[PDB]
């Protein structure tokens, strides 16, 4: 009976809750008590990457930590030389409504996606010398929210149709599709080991997936609104979630429960972009109040604010060496912090 | 200087890219972006055909003004969570079906189709982003609306309706209801038009609506209003 199945599901949820409570012998805040505080963390805008003429909905850092791609509503993908302000490429987009952008680890490809429901993979190292789209991945019934490159042939795409998928670039087909989120998926984070990847959706739940299996391993709850941003802890055994309820949450895959809630009374706007530092000591978050508050993961005490954007910080990325932070916002300007 | 020859050449390439970006931005400034929204049947196909996947963009020129429609009826997701991408569009071409006062949804037979239309209209008008993004209301399906209003009265959809079964009175009341749903009347405007399938005057009316959005945006930029 359907009622019997629902009762069994409720009993299983209660068992999961009981196990999670039994695992919570001590809180992370209590453990992080004798730790030396981070102090006042303050950076200035080292570089102001300007040239975008619309709101910047996405930005990714290359593996070299020098080339950065930015997606804006103007219909242009710009590859920036962060060291010396330069536009290596200005890729025109068929769909100006782009919400995600991804730089391949090898640096040869860049992806963009949005309301077109298509992940367009652009080839940069072409003999013709102009950026051309290698493949247009189609099959998602909802808007593209986040894409991340596993390699030159594999990409994982999160969409608003409550599904995520692993794509094969040369064939253009979905090798594996991930299903189980109730609401629209907005952000996905690839683990540093690349075996797993976690994604946050509108159902206030984050789910850790296996790219070679296709089944959800663990689901994490705790938020009261849509999870807008997600990023993996550099260890790869934890991750952080930004949601519209003005609080960040750091979950752990070895305990499947929340560890710390990064909330302040002053901030009421939600988090649009979440990114960790190199050591995980800094949980940089992009809020809708035209600010980017630098948090401390171990102690939920604010370390600093990245004021300087006239509009909402929509994207936030940290380099592979931890040298710089990009805070692309709706003010049509990207800023590099250090 | 302290710039190598390749560094200077890359800087010049960046300057050329900025020049092209500025040219494209100047071209896009003259462009006008319209968000085509609707509820129920919404008769939006008639407007798309007359006035000329997840998103469609029907581009058309009318009187030396490039127009860009964006129909998002196939999105089928939380409207709040991608409606922010359209903050800055010139206007919204909302499309209500004047002849859905008797038609009802397959599910939730208690709620009429046009009640859901007004619910979505109240959602989009009083949206947090589109406080000043004016709405070009399109009261389409007028012919069979008149046909139905010949037999069935408008009271079956609104018990508050006290007027003659004539087309003009019912149409005026529906327009008044939709305009009364505009809570913030001091910032944005509602432009109403009954779909005229003759000589393509709908494109013309959208042209005048867009011209006023442009003029009031110029005034706001100039501070006179």
């Amino acid at each position, epitope marked *: 009976e359907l009622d019997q199945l629902r009762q069994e599901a409720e009993q299983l949820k209660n068992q999961i809750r009981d196990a999670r409570k039994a695992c919570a012998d001590a809180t992370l805040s209590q453990i992080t008590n004798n730790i030396d505080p981070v102090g006042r963390i303050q950076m200035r805008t080292r570089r102001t990457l300007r040239g975008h003429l619309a709101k910047i909905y996405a930005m990714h850092w290359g593996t070299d930590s*020098r*080339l950065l791609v930015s997606a804006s509503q103007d219909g242009k993908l710009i590859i920036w*030389d962060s060291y010396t302000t*330069n536009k*290596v*490429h200005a890729i025109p987009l068929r769909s100006s409504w782009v919400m995600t952008c991804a730089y391949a680890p090898s*640096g040869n490809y860049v992806a963009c996606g949005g309301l077109d429901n298509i992940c367009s993979i652009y080839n940069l*190292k072409t*003999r*013709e*010398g*102009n950026v051309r789209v290698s493949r247009e991945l189609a099959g998602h019934t909802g808007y593209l929210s986040c894409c991340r490159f596993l390699d030159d042939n594999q990409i994982v795409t999160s969409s608003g149709d409550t599904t995520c998928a692993l794509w094969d670039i040369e064939t253009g087909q979905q090798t594996t599709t991930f299903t189980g989120h109730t609401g629209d998926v907005m952000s996905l984070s690839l683990a540093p080991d690349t075996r797993l990847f976690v994604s946050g959706a509108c159902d206030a739940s984050a789910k850790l997936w296996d790219v070679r299996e296709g089944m959800c391993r663990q689901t994490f709850t705790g938020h009261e609104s849509d999870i807008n941003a997600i990023c993996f802890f550099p260890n790869g055994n934890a991750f952080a979630t930004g949601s519209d309820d003005a609080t960040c949450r750091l979950f752990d895959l070895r305990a499947d429960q929340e560890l710390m809630t990064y909330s302040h009374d002053n901030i009421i706007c939600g988090i649009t972009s979440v990114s960790f530092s190199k050591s995980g000591r800094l949980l940089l978050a992009g809020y809708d109040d035209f600010n980017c508050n630098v948090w401390d993961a171990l102690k939920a005490d604010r370390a600093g604010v990245l004021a300087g954007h006239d509009n909402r910080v929509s994207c936030l990325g940290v380099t592979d060496d931890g040298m710089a932070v990009a805070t692309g916002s709706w003010d049509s300007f990207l800023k590099i912090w250090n | 200087c*302290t710039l*190598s*020859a*390749e*560094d*200077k*050449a*890359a800087v*010049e*390439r960046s300057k*050329m890219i900025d020049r092209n970006l500025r040219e494209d931005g100047e071209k896009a400034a003259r462009e006008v972006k319209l968000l085509l929204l609707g509820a129920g049947e919404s008769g939006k196909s008639t407007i798309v055909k007359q006035m000329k996947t997840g998103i469609v963009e029907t581009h058309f020129t009318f009187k030396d003004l490039h127009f860009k429609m964006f129909d998002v009826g196939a999105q089928r997701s939380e409207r709040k969570k991608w409606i922010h991408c359209f903050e800055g569009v010139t206007a919204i071409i909302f499309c209500v079906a004047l002849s859905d006062y008797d038609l009802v949804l397959a599910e939730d037979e208690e709620m009429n189709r046009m009640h859901e239309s007004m619910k979505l209209f109240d959602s989009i008008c009083n949206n947090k982003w589109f406080t000043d993004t004016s709405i070009i209301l399109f009261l389409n399906k007028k012919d069979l609306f008149e046909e139905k209003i010949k037999k069935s009265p408008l009271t079956i959809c609104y018990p508050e309706y006290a007027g003659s079964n004539t087309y003009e009175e019912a149409a005026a009341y529906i327009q008044c209801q939709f305009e009364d749903l505009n809570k913030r009347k001091d910032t944005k405007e509602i432009y109403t038009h009954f779909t005229c399938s003759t000589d393509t005057k709908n494109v013309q009316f959208v042209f005048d609506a867009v011209t006023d959005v442009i003029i009031k945006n110029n005034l706001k930029d100039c501070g006179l209003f």
Partner: single-chain antibody
Amino acid sequence: VQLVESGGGLVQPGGSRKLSCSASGFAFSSFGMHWVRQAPEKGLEWVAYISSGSGTIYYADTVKGRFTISRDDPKNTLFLQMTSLRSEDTAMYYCVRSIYYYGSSPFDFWGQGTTLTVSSSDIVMTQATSSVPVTPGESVSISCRSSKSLLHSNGNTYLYWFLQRPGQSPQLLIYRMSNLASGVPDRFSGSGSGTAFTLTISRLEAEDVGVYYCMQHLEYPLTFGAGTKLEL
């Protein structure tokens, strides 16, 4: 990708000639364009360079004033208007493309060339190796020396390696003194210290027979070397 050229042939001294370069297979507007000439039995020499958008135009000392370089981006063609020709200008000229951005591969493609016959401060490079016989399966190191250090403050060395097979056009081997070009086998490798540079071939075959040239891009009066000939 092709960069064929036209014009050429016999010309009287003091006359004028125009050398064209038809470009196909690549977005010609995006690449800055070069002219490198090779005298009958001597090394390569840089003549003129025109940039993307023709904003930057440089000439060599010998061709200053006498020659003018121009490009027609809509026509995808490159021009070299040559006036007051002398017996020094007798050479088969090459049309060379070079795109310039972060991590680009300048001088990646070289045209076949057109033969011209005229009736009868800058950085220097020495390649004293001249002619050295090689055997298949062996390994060689080609030596190039620069008078001025090519290590710029940005961290990039600006030495390029080129290979000219007998009868064929030069082909890029190494750019930025370390980076391997596109399509060249991985056996070729490049290393240097700023003023002294070497190129290593792990294993040689019949396709490695030719003469090797080293170039700089630090200061735009570009100069080649004498050449390292590899016989069999």
